[PDB]
Amino acid sequence: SKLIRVENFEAYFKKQQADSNCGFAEEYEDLKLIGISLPKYAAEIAENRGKNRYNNVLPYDISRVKLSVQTHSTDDYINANYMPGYHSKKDFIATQGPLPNTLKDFWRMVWEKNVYAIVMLTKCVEQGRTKCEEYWPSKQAQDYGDITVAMTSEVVLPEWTIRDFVVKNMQSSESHPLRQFHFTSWPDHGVPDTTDLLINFRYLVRDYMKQIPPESPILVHCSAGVGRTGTFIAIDRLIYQIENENTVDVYGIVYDLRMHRPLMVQTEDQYVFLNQCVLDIIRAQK
Numbered sequence: 001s002k003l004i005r006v007e008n009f010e011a012y013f014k015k016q017q018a019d020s021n022c023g024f025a026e027e028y029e030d031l032k033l034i035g036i037s038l039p040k041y042a043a044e045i046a047e048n049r050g051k052n053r054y055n056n057v058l059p060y061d062i063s064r065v066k067l068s069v070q071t072h073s074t075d076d077y078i079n080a081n082y083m084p085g086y087h088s089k090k091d092f093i094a095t096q097g098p099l100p101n102t103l104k105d106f107w108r109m110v111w112e113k114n115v116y117a118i119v120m121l122t123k124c125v126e127q128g129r130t131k132c133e134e135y136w137p138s139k140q141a142q143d144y145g146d147i148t149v150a151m152t153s154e155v156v157l158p159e160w161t162i163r164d165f166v167v168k169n170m171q172s173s174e175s176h177p178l179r180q181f182h183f184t185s186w187p188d189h190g191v192p193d194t195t196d197l198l199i200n201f202r203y204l205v206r207d208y209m210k211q212i213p214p215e216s217p218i219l220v221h222c223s224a225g226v227g228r229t230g231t232f233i234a235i236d237r238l239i240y241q242i243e244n245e246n247t248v249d250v251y252g253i254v255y256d257l258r259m260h261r262p263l264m265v266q267t268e269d270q271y272v273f274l275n276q277c278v279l280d281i282i283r284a285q286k
């Protein structure tokens with residue numbers, strides 16, 4: 001009974017918000033251990049440890065994105081997992097902000113996994129610390145291993161920047177577009193003050209995704225690719241749920257996310273923020 005009909009969501013939210021979000025805290029605490037016993041052997045292989053941004057954010061083997069192998073099995077490794085969306089088990093790839101040594105891997109994943117959209121939910125640097133490499137080029141083409149990327153346009157707003165690229169595999173002469181939705185306005189601490197901007201940003205991503213071929217995972221990342229990333233993915237899923245079923249199951253969504261990657265929706269504030277998102281969406285349904 002974690003399924004809440006939208007007609008009952010506001011009352012549910014108020015209930016869960018009582019006593020300093022006690023109910024939300026309880027739901028979130030219930031999620032705490034979900035997925036954590038899933039093996040993460042590839043992530044722990046010596047050769048792969050340095051490919052992880054955070055030693056405690058490791059992809060579960062069961063859902064990890066496996067890249068092509070060249071000379072060594074560990075070539076398959078990237079700190080990323082397929083995350084189900086509303087429609088399919090591979091609607092998303094949640095991944096960490098790539099490192100200087102995983103840039104090639106990052107683009108190889110982008111290429112091999114048919115990514116046309118990247119959602120980036122972090123600044124490269126937040127509070128004087130590197131959260132993510134600037135892994136994308138300007139107009140001047142850059143090669144990342146066999147993958148060449150050139151930015152074709154960039155539109156900056158205070159809230160987010162949207163960048164279009166052409167991604168080409170130089171080995172095959174295949175290419176296709178990629179749009180990167182760079183949400184630059186997530187607060188350095190805590191969640192956004194309001195939900196509308198992130199929700200509108202999600203709508204922008206979705207608007208673009210309508211133009212994209214099938215089986216094209218949205219690559220979503222922040223720093224660790226779990227907190228903001230999980231929040232964004234959950235919001236996307238919740239919106240479909242609301243739109244298609246008039247029900248929400250934030251718990252079920254986050255649970256599912258946790259079964260695919262650790263820490264998805266990494267703070268209680270984020271979890272409450274999701275519920276706030278649902279409330280705002282429902283309320284904004286005149």
Ligand SMILES: [Cl-]
Pocket residue numbers: 084089
């Ligand atoms: Cl699954």
